[PDB]
Amino acid sequence: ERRNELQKQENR
Amino acid sequence: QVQLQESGPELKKPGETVKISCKVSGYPFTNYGMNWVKQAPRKVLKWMGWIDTYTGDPTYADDFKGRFAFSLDTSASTAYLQINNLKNEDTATYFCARGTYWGQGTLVTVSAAKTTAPSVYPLAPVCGDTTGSSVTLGCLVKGYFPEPVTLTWNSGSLSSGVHTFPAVLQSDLYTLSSSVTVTSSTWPSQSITCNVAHPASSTKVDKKIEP
Amino acid sequence: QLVLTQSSSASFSLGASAKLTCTLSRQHSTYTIEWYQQQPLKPPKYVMELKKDGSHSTGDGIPDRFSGSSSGADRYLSISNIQEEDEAIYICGVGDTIKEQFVYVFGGGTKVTVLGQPKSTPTLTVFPPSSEELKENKATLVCLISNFSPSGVTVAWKANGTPITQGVDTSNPTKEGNKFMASSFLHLTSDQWRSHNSFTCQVTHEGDTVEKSLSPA
Numbered sequence: 001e002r003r004n005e006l007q008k009q010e011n012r
Numbered sequence: 013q014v015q016l017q018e019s020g021p022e023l024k025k026p027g028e029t030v031k032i033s034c035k036v037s038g039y040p041f042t043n044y045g046m047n048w049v050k051q052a053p054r055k056v057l058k059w060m061g062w063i064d065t066y067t068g069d070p071t072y073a074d075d076f077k078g079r080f081a082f083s084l085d086t087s088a089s090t091a092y093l094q095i096n097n098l099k100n101e102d103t104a105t106y107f108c109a110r111g112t113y114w115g116q117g118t119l120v121t122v123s124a125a126k127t128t129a130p131s132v133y134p135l136a137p138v139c140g141d142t143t144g145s146s147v148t149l150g151c152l153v154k155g156y157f158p159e160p161v162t163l164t165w166n167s168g169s170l171s172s173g174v175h176t177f178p179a180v181l182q183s184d185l186y187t188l189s190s191s192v193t194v195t196s197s198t199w200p201s202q203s204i205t206c207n208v209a210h211p212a213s214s215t216k217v218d219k220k221i222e223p
Numbered sequence: 224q225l226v227l228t229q230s231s232s233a234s235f236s237l238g239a240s241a242k243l244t245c246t247l248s249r250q251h252s253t254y255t256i257e258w259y260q261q262q263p264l265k266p267p268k269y270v271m272e273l274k275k276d277g278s279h280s281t282g283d284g285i286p287d288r289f290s291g292s293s294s295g296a297d298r299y300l301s302i303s304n305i306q307e308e309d310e311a312i313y314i315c316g317v318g319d320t321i322k323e324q325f326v327y328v329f330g331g332g333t334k335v336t337v338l339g340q341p342k343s344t345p346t347l348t349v350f351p352p353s354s355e356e357l358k359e360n361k362a363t364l365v366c367l368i369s370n371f372s373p374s375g376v377t378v379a380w381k382a383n384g385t386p387i388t389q390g391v392d393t394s395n396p397t398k399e400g401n402k403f404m405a406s407s408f409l410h411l412t413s414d415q416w417r418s419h420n421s422f423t424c425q426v427t428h429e430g431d432t433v434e435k436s437l438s439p440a
Contacts, residue, residue: 004045004062004318005111006327008255010274012320047327049267057259057267057314059327071325111257112269112282135350135365139440148348152356152365175369175399177406182392189365189406191348 014038016108016115023121023158023212028098032118034091034108041089042066044110048082048093051117052104063091098122121158128185130156132208132217135191143196148173149221150191151206155184160211163190167204225251225319227330237339241302245315245330252296257316260309261332263398267314273298302335307401310337342429343402345371349424349435352416362416364409364437366424371396371403373429378407381423 019033034046048060061072063082070082083092091108098120105117135150137143153161159179165172173193179186194204200223208217228246235241247254258270269282271291279291288303302309314332318325345368352362368376374396380387393407407424416422417439425434 002043002045002064002066004047004325004327006047006062006257006316006318007320007325008272008318011251011254011318049329055261055312056331057261057316057329059316059329062325062327073326107266109267114266114268117266133353133356133363135353138351139438150348150350150365150367152350152353152363154363175367175404177367177404178394178397180392180394180406180408182408182410187363187392187408189367189408191367 014110014113016110016113018106018108018115018118021119021121021158021160021212023123023127024098025124026098026100026122029094029096030098030120032093032095032106032108032120034093034115036089036091036110039110042086046082046091047109047111048080049107049109049114050076050104051107052101060093065091095120119160123158125157125184127212128155128157129213129215130154130161130208130210130217132206132219134206134219134221135189136221136223145196146173146193147196147199148191148193149199149204150189151208151219153188153190153208155187156210156213157185158212159186161186161188162209162211163188164207164209165190165192165204166207167202168192168194168198224248225317225326225328227256227315227317227328229313229315229330229333231331232334232336234336234338235302235305237307237337238304241300241305241309241335243300243302243313243333243335245298245300247296247298247317249296251317251319254317254319256298258291258298258300259314259316259329261312261314262310270300270313273300305337307337307340309335311335340372340401343370343372344431345369345376345426345428345433347424347426347433347435349422349437351422351437351439352411352413357413357416360413362411362413364411364416364422364424366407366409366426366435367404368396368406368426369399369402369404371428372401374398374403375428376403376405377425377427378405379425379427380407380409381425382419383421384423 050058108115133152273291348367350365390410
């Protein structure tokens with residue numbers, strides 16, 4: 001559940 | 013309701029070490045990681061890295077390896093940033109950011125120069141003066157360091173004519189001025205004084221304006 | 224390299240529509256960016272998330288006049304019916320993950336100026352050195368300039384009608400509400416103040432000159 005809010009799955 | 017409250021300004025000499033806190037309220041602390049951002053006087057925001065608020069696993073940006081350390085106090089919903097072996101270039105405002113929420117910032121000033129309490133002088137009108145309807149009075153705040161000074165006038169109150177003119181750094185120290193405009197029959201009738209507060213030197217100066 | 228490109232500055236008239244550009248590098252052109260707004264005495268504020276298809280989602284406290292759009296590697300912040308409160312530096316940000324390794328990057332930012340603010344002549348207030356400061360055998364003369372627009376000024380000192388440059392420190396014009404203010408100080412010794420018949424602070428704004436004087440009498 002927890003992660004960096006700035007982390008977007010589409011940006012890999 | 014969501015708020016990230018950071019510790020106050022810090023004045024350190026080079027080679028010293030500073031510890032900045034970021035108190036999280038309004039959401040579950042361990043749900044989101046905490047980012048740290050640097051904004052040097054240039055004002056360009058710079059990502060320093062982030063920390064997992066459960067594990068305490070930090071990730072540092074390329075420019076922030078070695079001297080920078082992120083830590084937690086999960087129980088207290090507090091994130092910390094520690095900068096070791098300080099340098100002049102570390103003079104910047106430091107932010108903790110969830111991403112969509114940001115802290116107010118913490119100004120870190122790296123200087124070998126001592127904290128100086130300001131000299132406060134009253135500013136009143138000249139010899140041949142009849143201000144007609146309204147009279148203007150000021151307070152000169154000279155030779156202080158660093159720049160966190162805050163002035164309050166409480167003889168009239170609020171924005172009666174209270175103008176706070178930003179500081180200028182001549183030679184070693186900073187200088188500021190703040191004025192107040194009141195009715196010509198309120199001064200020198202009803203007493204007027206000003207309160208100067210320099211938090212870095214923990215002082216408060218007060219000057220009564222006389223003609 | 225994960226690089227974002229923006230303009231250094233831009234100006235718009237009040238009520239117009241501002242389109243700001245944030246450009247993703249050749250690779251990463253399908254990446255989602257974030258927009259932040261930064262006003263002078265405030266921390267940055269999240270504006271929105273903007274995906275490759277123009278899809279956007281704004282933050283809390285963000286008015287309806289803020290919207291996004293995208294082309295290829297270009298991400299646009301559209302501000303409709305731009306207000307004077309929308310004067311700020313707009314910064315974009317982008318994240319990237321490699322092998323479970325998160326990295327975030329900010330752009331250089333775009334300073335946004337909103338025009339149509341009413342032109343106003345400066346008000347000069349000159350104070351002589353206090354009796355207290357003169358006991359330290361020092362003398363600071365204060366020139367307080369206020370209520371002016373646009374920012375562009377020239378501050379000049381005069382003693383006995385003769386220009387004084389020694390001991391003059393002038394501030395830059397700083398925004399204070401819908402106008403500007405600035406200050407200038409003239410540091411002389413005591414008796415240097417008392418050996419001159421009057422002192423003048425001149426301010427030139429839009430070719431017009433405004434001046435005030437002090438009398439050691």
